[PDB]
Amino acid sequence: MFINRWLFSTNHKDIGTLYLLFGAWAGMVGTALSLLIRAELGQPGTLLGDDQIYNVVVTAHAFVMIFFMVMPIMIGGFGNWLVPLMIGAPDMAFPRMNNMSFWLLPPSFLLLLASSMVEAGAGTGWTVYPPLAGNLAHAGASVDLTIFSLHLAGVSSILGAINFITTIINMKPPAMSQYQTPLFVWSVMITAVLLLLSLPVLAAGITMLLTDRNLNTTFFDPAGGGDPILYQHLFWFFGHPEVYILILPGFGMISHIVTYYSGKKEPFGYMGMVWAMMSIGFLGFIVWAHHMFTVGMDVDTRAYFTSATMIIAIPTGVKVFSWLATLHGGNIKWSPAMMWALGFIFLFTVGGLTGIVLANSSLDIVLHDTYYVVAHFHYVLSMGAVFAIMGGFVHWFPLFSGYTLNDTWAKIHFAIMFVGVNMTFFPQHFLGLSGMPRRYSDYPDAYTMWNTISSMGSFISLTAVMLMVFIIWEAFASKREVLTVDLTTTNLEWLNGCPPPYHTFEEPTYVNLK
Amino acid sequence: APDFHDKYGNAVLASGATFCVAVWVYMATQIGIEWNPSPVGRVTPKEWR
Amino acid sequence: MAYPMQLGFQDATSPIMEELLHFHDHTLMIVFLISSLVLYIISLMLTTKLTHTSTMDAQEVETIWTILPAIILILIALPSLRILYMMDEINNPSLTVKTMGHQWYWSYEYTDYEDLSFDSYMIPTSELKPGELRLLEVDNRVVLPMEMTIRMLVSSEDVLHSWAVPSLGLKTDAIPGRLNQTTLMSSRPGLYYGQCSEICGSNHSFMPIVLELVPLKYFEKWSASML
Amino acid sequence: KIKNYQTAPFDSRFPNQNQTRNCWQNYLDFHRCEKAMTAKGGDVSVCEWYRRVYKSLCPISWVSTWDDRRAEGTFPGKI
Amino acid sequence: STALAKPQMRGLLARRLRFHIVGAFMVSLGFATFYKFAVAEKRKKAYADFYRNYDSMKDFEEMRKAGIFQSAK
Amino acid sequence: HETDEEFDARWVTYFNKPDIDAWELRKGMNTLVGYDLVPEPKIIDAALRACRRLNDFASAVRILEVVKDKAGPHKEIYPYVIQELRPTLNELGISTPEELGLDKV
Amino acid sequence: SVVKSEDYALPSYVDRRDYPLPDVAHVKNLSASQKALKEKEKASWSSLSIDEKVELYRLKFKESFAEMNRSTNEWKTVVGAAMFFIGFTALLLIWEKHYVYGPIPHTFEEEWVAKQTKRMLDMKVAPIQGFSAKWDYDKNEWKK
Amino acid sequence: ASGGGVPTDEEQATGLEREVMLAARKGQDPYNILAPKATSGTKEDPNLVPSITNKRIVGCICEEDNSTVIWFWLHKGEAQRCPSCGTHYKLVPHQLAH
Amino acid sequence: ITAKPAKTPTSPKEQAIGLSVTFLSFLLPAGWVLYHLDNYKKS
Amino acid sequence: ASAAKGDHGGTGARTWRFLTFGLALPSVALCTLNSWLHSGHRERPAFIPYHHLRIRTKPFSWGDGNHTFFHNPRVNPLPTGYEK
Amino acid sequence: FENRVAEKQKLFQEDNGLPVHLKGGATDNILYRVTMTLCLGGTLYSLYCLGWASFPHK
Amino acid sequence: HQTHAYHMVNPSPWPLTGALSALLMTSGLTMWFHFNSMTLLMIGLTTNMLTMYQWWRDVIRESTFQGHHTPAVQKGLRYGMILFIISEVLFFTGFFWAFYHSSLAPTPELGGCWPPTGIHPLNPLEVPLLNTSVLLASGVSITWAHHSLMEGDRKHMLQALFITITLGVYFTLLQASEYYEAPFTISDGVYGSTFFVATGFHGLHVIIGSTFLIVCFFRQLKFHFTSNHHFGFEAAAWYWHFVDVVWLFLYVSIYWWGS
Amino acid sequence: HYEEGPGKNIPFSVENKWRLLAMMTLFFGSGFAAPFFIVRHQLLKK
Ligand code: HEA
Ligand SMILES: CCCCC/C=C\C/C=C/C/C=C/C/C=C\CCCC(=O)O[C@H](COC(=O)CCCCCCCCCCCCCCCCC)COP(=O)(O)OCCN
Ligand SMILES: CCCCCC/C=C\CCCCCCCCCC(=O)O[C@H](COC(=O)CCCCCCCCCCCCCCC)COP(=O)(O)OC[C@@H](O)CO
Ligand SMILES: CCCCCCCCCCO[C@@H]1O[C@H](CO)[C@@H](O[C@H]2O[C@H](CO)[C@@H](O)[C@H](O)[C@H]2O)[C@H](O)[C@H]1O
Ligand SMILES: CCCCCCCCCCO[C@@H]1O[C@H](CO)[C@@H](O[C@H]2O[C@H](CO)[C@@H](O)[C@H](O)[C@H]2O)[C@H](O)[C@H]1O
Ligand SMILES: C[C@H](CCC(=O)O)[C@H]1CC[C@H]2[C@@H]3[C@H](O)C[C@@H]4C[C@H](O)CC[C@]4(C)[C@H]3C[C@H](O)[C@]12C
Ligand code: CUA
Ligand SMILES: [Cu+2]
Ligand SMILES: [Mg+2]
Ligand code: NA
Ligand SMILES: [Zn+2]
């Protein structure tokens, strides 16, 4: 029974729970790697070794946080648990292929851990540029094990995207149009279209890198007529949509959490929120060379990528102002999930505005490959994707488990993490404007003060991560069972009770046309 | 009936504040951390050549 | 170079860097203001017991939300793109210098007239002379004439690097098989520092750039003595 | 005329940051010229300009590799 | 005794919002007058004043005599 | 759409329906408090008389608490509304939340 | 009275200031005297005593508005405990400094810093605003 | 040119696929493929909600084009009303293998 | 939300134990490695 | 652009069968003749050890490491020239 | 050939509680065990190969 | 008992065996490229084949034999197959982008020209045009197969599908022969790299599509398809048109324009 | 069928809070420790 239920699952809730457990375990691995980065940098000199072991740790930090923590938790974990329930569907369209998206992740993570154990690791940056990642400067198996880890994560998510698109388009009640589905469901559908189109291009580029490293092709080697800059284009044609894939399901959860704790029946400006997520998904495919403003591209190309990149601020601003307008007039409930969402709105806005600074290619000449970029994306990733994940986890933990968290502890947890992440990242803006490069194991002495404080901040976020594990333990240890939840008339995923039965919607909802 | 906050709230606030300030001041000032502050107004420049 | 506790950009050594500082100030003001406008509306939404929870009409207010951001973006993009095209304008260099990135040091070639080239490596910390800067000094500096337009051409003989000097506003990647060009003009003599700016393996943190800007006649005699 | 050569001038055929083809074309033009001149008995000194320009722009290791390959019979450009 | 007067009862949230969005804008103008004056203008003036009578040869000679250069003693 | 008077008149009529049932009483008050206003005395009066036809004393009291709550920090509003309702409170024997001690935390 | 997990599909009671008249009464089962008080409620409310009115209110509702909206001391516990765990963090950092980090580089020695500072002033590091601008080259001292 | 040899669905469809095809022929919808059309929804003319059990979730799209759906359980017994628009629904339980 | 009282209440003392053991499970193994770094390197 | 055929007024298998045997397979038979005229070994070019060709940055994982996967002795020289 | 789909329909619909991947009878159990044994044994072998390759070789 | 039309699948080991096959094929390719051994890779190829076989067998049991493919299930599988084809189009797009990037701006190492110095392209009017005629023809014969099946004609469906698979095999044998005869290799700079990797992945998809058509041929022989329900055949026909269109773009781009 | 309800829809037991503490400690602790041991491994090799 155990093996049939948990290794052979065809059930969207249990597979969702598997993804949440996997993403939580990955989050401890990415957190340890982030503390090794900040231990190395927390005083001037060398702690670990030279930039090879250091950038192995920096490279694995990014891949684990992106591919093994954020994507599995937001799409595999909350997408699987919530999407079928929010549309009244009995499961995903392909419930058995769904379990293969999940099971391809432990082997992908194994390959990445094997990459770091064999030879000297892949110290390449999560962008894996050649020729540093090629077979002369990174001889031996590490970088091929990293490529294969990305192939397996890539297939897992392409098959997941097919499953979510099909399910969302095909398995709603026959009266429900796509403009009667909740915003979190729209966010998963758009993110799954971005995955379906972008991952195959990254799969093409890292396959080319694999054949340059093992079949004597020369896609990226000038000796054969190849070009290292072609790899960058193929990688970033995926890598920009990838950051919108990491944040979109977060925007979807934030819309629900803000609505719910404002005591509202619906988010402000629903069709403008759908329009904004479609426009961001669309524009997210025509901006990628803002990652390449120092590679030597022409002036008019740099003018076009500057402008198209800034344009994304228009639909993104619609969503920020619509979340404000959804709080407007609310009966505000200061739950811990609400605090995570308000922290999200403010910290995502800070990091989106430093993204606007960087879209100016002339200023990006000086800020590129410095810690100003690190600050920009950690404000949207550890204070946007992470805060939307912690908001949705505390909000829906009682639905998934049937038990309540202690809200006082969860507020304490939010307060410690908000102090730690701002102590960690805010000073990295000063380090970047004043010129500290990325991917450095050590720095000129003048950069000491801000690196010291940023490292002290990372330890405060470590204390928050340890406490979060205790908080989850305390909830399962005390077993306070949920009785009633507010606002079920506009939050269908709660209406089958906590936790819902293994099979829900065996009889579908009744929705008339009129 | 008074709950946990009514009974212990004042003590948790006072002691957590006291402890936090004491341990950060000690960490910042007593164990050899080199903050590397600006020399401006602090350092007397000395002949190097 | 950067100094301790520094918050903003290194002081400008070149007119283009000066333009970037004024443009950054223009932009950061916007940034300030939008972030504070948001923090503030937000605290306004959250600080009343009055409620209004019935359906709200979105049409009018969405006009404000798209138009005002669009205008603010145009107010940033106009000066941004003026600077972009200004730096691109033709400027007639008096000298061309090449630099090749290597693991882990830079070489320099000044071949307009003679065959002058040499390697430039970080000074190891244990060999710094008193007052020299850890991780920044080099054995052989990139001597150049002040107040003159110089074409720098940048490439690599192995993996990617990137040749940067933040006080001149410069960062051009060093790609093997490619020759990227940038122009450099210093308003002042002195020593201007930068650091390799694309991850390139074990000693990426340890291959800095030091430019030494001096009067033309000093540059000429230094050039002749380096043959 | 154009002694007082300082460096290679701006060339509107190669106005962008990537100057690889500028080095390459001047190297080709020089050697094509020198073959024309030392074929037809004439004077290589007429090729001097291309030589100055490619020497200024081209990395020493590229010139050196291209010269080794012309000598080996493996230079892939047409001269 | 006296009756209490009738107070405004309707649109209280909208009225509070109107009042404060205007106060929120007036900061932004007032802060924009700061910021600009304390940082941006101050920078333009520090650069203009520095270069107005700046002598680059004299700056070079001071550096050369302080022994900072490889190429010039 | 409509003037303030028309808004108020439609709500007075809603609660004045003689055979209004318990579900409609609850639907009306829980809808009405979603608006950006504190209901005028004449609306509350008709809701309190609907409570009386439905033999529901407690809901009359709760309606008076929700008027106070919809006023937020405008503390002059509720005492003015209770003043205006006193003839109806006396005629129906409705005690206010304060007279019942139900304002104590 | 007693809410059961197995009732989740049934209309339920809630105290919320934005849903003042919930879907069911807080108490539906009535004792003999409670049944008599519901009969009495059909007659004039002026004949109910204050205790009878309060008892009808408490059959219908669980908490009053003043009760369900009360402020609490929870913030003390949250802020205090957060400061505690922030304080505990500095223990970790004291431990790391004592047992993990070795000596920092000799370039932070006081005499080195004095010499490097003079050499930064001699090369006029950031002479417009950032560093040498703050040194008085006439009086040989930091500007006031 | 044109033997047969290819089975039709009438001959060879089986299991649920067959049940759906046989019911559609009768104009019946036991597996909820089609959206039900609303009645006027008054208490005398309530929307009638079939079910194989004693309760079923209703979603009420109160006005045409609303993006917000209002969801609630409908139980066997007296008609209930949508808590947003008041339109009436009544459960009509029971039996499937017709 | 409302919920039942805990079926298996976790007293202050039991929370202090769960919190201590959870913190030590992260601090001890990393602390052992970082403490012995000089041993790994000078080796 | 219609193309030049000219059908409809009913439909289906019969017409696509007609297209299969009356146009598609004839085209294949024709191209099969065209190919089987210009087939058979064309004389191999002087070997030149160009550095952009015969790339070897890592030995192949089969054979002696130096032969491509579908190496043809007659027309694929090695980095050092045509085999014996 | 003859159309024996009705025979297979009766086989796969027999009310014997078997999951579909085992419902064809004993040959499904055999092919399942062969597949699963190669997957799990191959996976142990891959871990062994990681252990081997994680250390410089003698 | 459900009263929706969707399919609750029985708990299945195949997702786990397929995920483990992936680990065994990738760690096996790593062993092969770096540790001189084919063992792990052959075990992963074998378990991947066994997994495909039993998983798709079970989908045929669930549909033809158990009746779970109602119209709503089939409509989902349509969307699934279309979205899969879109992702395979994007995968090829990356290799077309690599081809045009290198050929439109040929570097000095190539001689600054395309085709590079020393490359002698195949004549696009010889076997490449023959392969084009072969795959276009097989798009006409599969369309004949599809209309015969809809018209209930077993014998002509089988005859047209057999023709279509015979042309698939012909293109595969022609391409194998042209790879052997080609005077340039995958190691011949970015010309040989783009040529063999783009046409090589296309050839793999021709082999996959032909296999899928052969699966449809044996199910048709076993009478599984009705004249109205045959989604496996339609999916294989869409995937086969995809492989033909990709060939057309490769022919125009690499063999013709790039010659 | 399968067990349903709080504590029963998860692949780990919550029947005993101390045995649960041990399993959660091993689970999150092993993820957090792994990169320190990998770094140790990389340092020890060379
Ligand atoms: C969740 C992830 C995430 C998100 C959402 C974003 C959002 C944005 N990013 Fe970022 N970014 C990353 C993750 C993300 N980024 C990562 C990981 C990298 C580096 C990758 C690497 O090298 O490893 C990076 C790098 C990166 C670069 C390259 C810098 C360089 O390498 O030199 C640039 C340059 O344009 C950029 C710009 C932006 C912009 C304009 C947005 C915008 O989409 C933000 C739009 C949002 C707002 C603007 C805020 C809300 C709006 C309002 C309140 C309206 C009022 C506002 C205005 C009028 C402006 N990002
Ligand atoms: C005949 C029709 C075509 C079928 C091809 C037959 C052989 C292998 C099949 C796989 C085809 C896929 C492409 C992989 C790359 C290379 C193969 C290119 C096609 C090919 O077969 O190229 C041959 C080279 O093969 C070599 O190196 C062969 C090396 C074989 C190793 C395969 C490498 C593994 C690739 C990993 C793929 C990752 C997949 C990504 C999935 C993405 C996730 C979303 C050409 O021979 P040559 O002697 O150089 O020149 C001819 C000289 N007369
Ligand atoms: C060379 C070997 C190494 C590489 C591995 C791949 C090798 C070959 C694989 C060939 C693909 C064979 C697929 C066979 C599927 C048979 C199952 C099937 O076709 O199932 C059908 C459903 O379709 C369905 O699921 C449709 C599902 C089909 C999707 C499969 C097509 C492509 C998969 C390709 C894997 C791609 C690798 C990409 C390389 C980068 C069943 O419904 P019907 O047909 O309506 O029948 C019911 C009627 O009888 C009722 O009256
Ligand atoms: C980035 C995240 C890490 C944050 C910091 C971790 C805080 C440390 C928790 C304690 O870790 C322990 O510390 C002891 C020292 O206090 C070590 O004992 C060492 O030192 C003792 C005293 O010198 C000896 O008795 C022991 O044998 C010797 O192992 C012990 O091994 C290590 O587990
Ligand atoms: C029950 C389920 C299935 C699980 C099966 C597990 C099978 C385990 C068998 C491993 O033994 C072999 O050892 C060979 C050699 O001893 C190796 O080949 C390699 O070995 C050397 C390594 O270069 C060279 O001598 C060879 O050429 C090279 O092929 C290779 O590792 C493997 O074949
Ligand atoms: C024996 C069988 C009768 C089919 C049936 O109705 O069961 C027939 C009908 C169509 C036939 C097939 C098709 O005609 C196409 C092929 C033609 C070749 O000449 C022989 C094999 C070939 C693959 C045939 C074999 C066999 O004779 C088939 C399969
Ligand atoms: Cu050279 Cu980094
Ligand atoms: Cu981007
Ligand atoms: Mg870079
Ligand atoms: Na360091
Ligand atoms: Zn309704």
Author numbering:
A (entry chain A): 1 to 514
B (entry chain K): 6 to 54
C (entry chain B): 1 to 227
D (entry chain H): 7 to 85
E (entry chain I): 1 to 73
F (entry chain E): 5 to 109
G (entry chain D): 4 to 147
H (entry chain F): 1 to 98
Sentences from the study reporting this entry:
5 is the terminal oxidase of cellular respiration that reduces O2 to water, coupled with a proton-pumping process. The enzyme includes two redox-active metal sites as the low-potential sites (heme a (Fea) and CuA). These sites donate electrons to the O2 reduction site that comprises two high potential metal sites (heme a3 (Fea3) and CuB). The third proton-conducting pathway, the H-pathway, extends for proton pumping from the N-side surface to the P-side surface.
Complete saturation of the azide-binding metal sites is not attained by exposure of CcO to 20 mm azide for 2 days, whereas elongation of the exposure time up to 4 days does not significantly change the X-ray crystal structures. As typically shown in the results obtained by a 2-day exposure to 20 mm azide, the process of azide binding to the metal sites does not tightly synchronize with the progress of the structural changes in the heme a3 and helix X. The azide saturation period was found to be somewhat dependent on the CcO preparation batch. Some CcO batches provided the crystals, which require 2 days for saturation of the two terminal azide-binding sites.
